[model samples]
Target: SMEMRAVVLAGFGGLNKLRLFRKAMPEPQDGELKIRVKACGLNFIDLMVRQGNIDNPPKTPLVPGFECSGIVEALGDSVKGYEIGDRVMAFVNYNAWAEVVCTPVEFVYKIPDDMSFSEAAAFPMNFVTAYVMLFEVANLREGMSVLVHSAGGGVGQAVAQLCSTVPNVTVFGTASTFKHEAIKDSVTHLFDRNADYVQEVKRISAEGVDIVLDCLCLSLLKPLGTYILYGNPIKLYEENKVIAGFSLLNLLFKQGRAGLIRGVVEKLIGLYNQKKIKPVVDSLWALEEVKEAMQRIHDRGNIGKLILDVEKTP
Candidate 1:
């Protein structure tokens, strides 16, 4: 067994609780792949896991990460169609903030020949999240309009890009003014975070939008808007609007079906090949700088994805 450096959360608390430690390299079991991680993706959910806000948070001293990109180091029994040296991006329930991670093969996707590890690391979680919300749940189509919150974040940017694929689609996004320039082309209209989005959105489309994708629990909806809640829980009546709650973990863990995910991945890869959508990398940090990364996210300082350069370890 080899030892690998990992960011461990000793307990639920602030950034001070995060520590670097040596962990035994994990091994893949049936239908799994062991990846030598080059980069790992950071998300707000990692903050929830660190603060003990998420339901059934992993026990103390847990490794927290949701996605990573790396070289395939090994494969468990029953795995097929993948080689030991294939480049891949993977989605994991936890333990992704490590030099090596073992994830189910179904959650792994092969990266394009030209895609860098950092870019690949930013793909799976955010893009698939947007895909499931737009196509699978919301059933977005041409000539529809959507209102997306946190428009400068990873998933928000992905949502904006995916919306571009449809014809005659209008996207209204809310973000800080500083970020408006970076995402201006992707969205139809940009509103400052402090702006009155409810009134502004209604003024733009008095009939209401087809879908409202909100990261915050606050509902900014129109008369017949469909609120697709991704971040937090909210109480709303069926008579007022159509509401759908989505959690990627629920589909990966509870349903454990890869059929829909595979389709989404294929579509994203095609879009990437055509240069229709790409990840926005705000910054990259070393594995040992996990605390600083967490602090940046807590401060809402990043305009896009923050990556941990795992393979840069010495």
Candidate 2:
């Protein structure tokens, strides 16, 4: 065991409850590695977890971060292929917002030599989610079109870049008035989130879109049945819709396709390494500033990924 600093949730309610404290770091046991974290990517899901919105709740005083980039410092008894000092990014269940973490080797993936810690931190969640939504589940083809809500946000931005890589694929996105200008140029067509996207999609592509990656699930349920519902940010109250809830956990339970999830994540990492798509970081803040970061995202003020800069990195 070792000592390290970590951000812990004082109690779940609002951003004010998060606190940073010094804690003990666990050593790798079996098929696990101890990593010294470099950076943590701030995601909307982190805010949800901190606010007690996740379907499953952890006990109080828990650390809420899930995605991280770090350097491997120690390996478990049976760990293979990775050596000490290797840079890697991981998708773990929790406890990533610390100076050190012990994670299973399967959950950790080596970062390419050309990648930076910050970029590696930004890669896992957003790109992996977008990849599973578009390629594996939806089976999107070269000339197909899709709709992405919050095109200016982290997942939306990743979807835009990934869709562009497929020839003739079109992406329609929704964003607030303030973010429209920033996201308009990246999407095939950008619409006001408050506007009638059904009509807009009809106007743009009268035949209807092949897939709809909707995070605002409650509001889009009616129009959703026409396209594949890859997300459930809101509930769909309408009928005759093709919907499949998207999430790593959901995929595990419903599809039982963990291998597919890992494949998509690996492909996303490759794309990041090649610079075919890049993480659009909206802001970088010290770990102690998570409250402010949460508020900014809550207010819908960010255009891209809001990141937590745990360790100083250029």
Candidate 3:
């Protein structure tokens, strides 16, 4: 049979919507590339998408995953810079949590021979978003302070690792108490989720931080500050404060592909090759074990990235 194993969200509802169904194998489009999905990365968006809590939820009966890594199984007529059997990772629009996936080539990149399949799946979205937040949006610099909420999560760990790229930068992170010890050395200060992180952060650095990689924050920021969310850019216009939203999808579509994402991928690859950065693989689960995996994310017990092994059986 030319059927493929795919975790399809039959509808927008609870966990029951996720079903392991036999789906028709997808063919590459004119400009698409088909991949034998080795591993798929999970994100919080999976929860929101399941609960229909996000904007413009895709119609039901869709495969749900944002990123994965694998070998190229096929290519399109117009595809270039890639070959059959090449190892790579990508940010797929969807359908990543499956035996195979097809995506455009713009954001795709070859993984180093040393990079593992699980790490490849874990690398793309979290690292890219973290990179853009720290470097592009915030202009993270030497001798500055930063704050990261959910510091034990994928993006949080990524931000911590990237901060290592700079000098004399202090990082304050908030996560569940049990996770603190595991990530304690990565961040300069760690606070329990129940802690008054805002007040504690203020006490640690009275003038506030230079940047905050969070949904939104203020008052704990100094001048020349940038926040990844939760602010009114116009409110402090005269006071020289600014806030901007960051969305990889919006940028990918708006930039017409291979603009910023390509450049960032290249830089991240260099960092990886130098051993300065790495994605932490929390645990691996079989394709059919998705329910338990999703539950881990709900429990907030997941550290770093969770991976789904497409070739494995439950």
Candidate 4:
């Protein structure tokens, strides 16, 4: 039983429960590639993973990150197109907080030769999430205005950058006063999170924006224009607004297929290579410090993605 260091939840509930310990690193089965993790990016969803919020009944005592960067350590039988030692970033179906992970080769994207593991580490989740929700789900078009909630957070910032890159698109963001400066360049206008962004939106654009990339469901509860509910940052929506939600769960249900997942990873990597946008990482922590890292994310203190540097040895 070869074991490696990883961050695991003892049970569901709080960040206090994340414990670092050893676990057997499994060999890749068919179609899987074993990754020796270099870094794992953090998202608010990781906080959800900790609190029994993301999945049904939440799989407790589980290793909890969604995405990471690493080197290919081995390939399972029948796996193709990847070599040992290839620098790559991946979105895992299960856990990503460990020193090694086995992921489907389709979910793995080769890091551009010039990118560092740290930068590659931040790509998969945030950028792909933004791109999919905008282009695929919302069908965002050039010259349209987009209102983004949690505007300085990981997905919000990623959307802002992607929006900025598109021709003639207007970007608006909502965050606490403190994060405004950091995100101002990417967003054309900024509003306070607690402020009535609906009114603010009207004030900024009389007809309202073409799309609202909202995660605060409660804030937008009862519906709004072209709203995409990726997460319930606020958990309620208005009834009259035309809206659709995009959860990994709900989107899969709507699309009736998981194939879009790979398309998003590939498109995001292409964007990164083309310099259309880059993921903004806030900090990197050792695997042992996951509890603190989760707490930081929960507190909403970060301006960009937080990463766990899992390559550190036991």
Best by lDDT: 1
Q: TM-score for each prediction?
A: 0.93, 0.89, 0.95, 0.89
lDDT by residue for model 1 (82-129), tens: 999999999988999998999989899999998999999999888999
- Residues 219-304, model 2: lDDT tens digits: 23334333434434333443445667667645643455656767877788777777789888888888878889889988889987
| Root-mean-square deviation (CA) per prediction | 2.5, 3.8, 2.0, 3.9
lDDT scores in order = 0.87, 0.79, 0.85, 0.78
Q: Flag the better candidate by lDDT, 1 or 4.
A: 1
* lDDT score of residue 69 within candidate 4: 90
lDDT of each residue in 145-216, candidate 4, tens digit only: 888888888888889888877889988889989888777887888999887777877776777777778774
Q: Return the lDDT, model 2, position 190.
A: 90
Clashes of each: 0, 6, 1, 18
List candidate 1 stretches off by more than 4 Å: 216-224, 232-240, 312-314
Ranking by lDDT: 1, 3, 2, 4
Which has the higher TM-score value, candidate number 1 or candidate number 4? 1
Worst 10 residues of 3 by lDDT: 230-239
Task: After the best TM-score superposition of candidate 3, give how far the Cα of residue 304 lies from its true spot, in angstroms.
Answer: 0.6
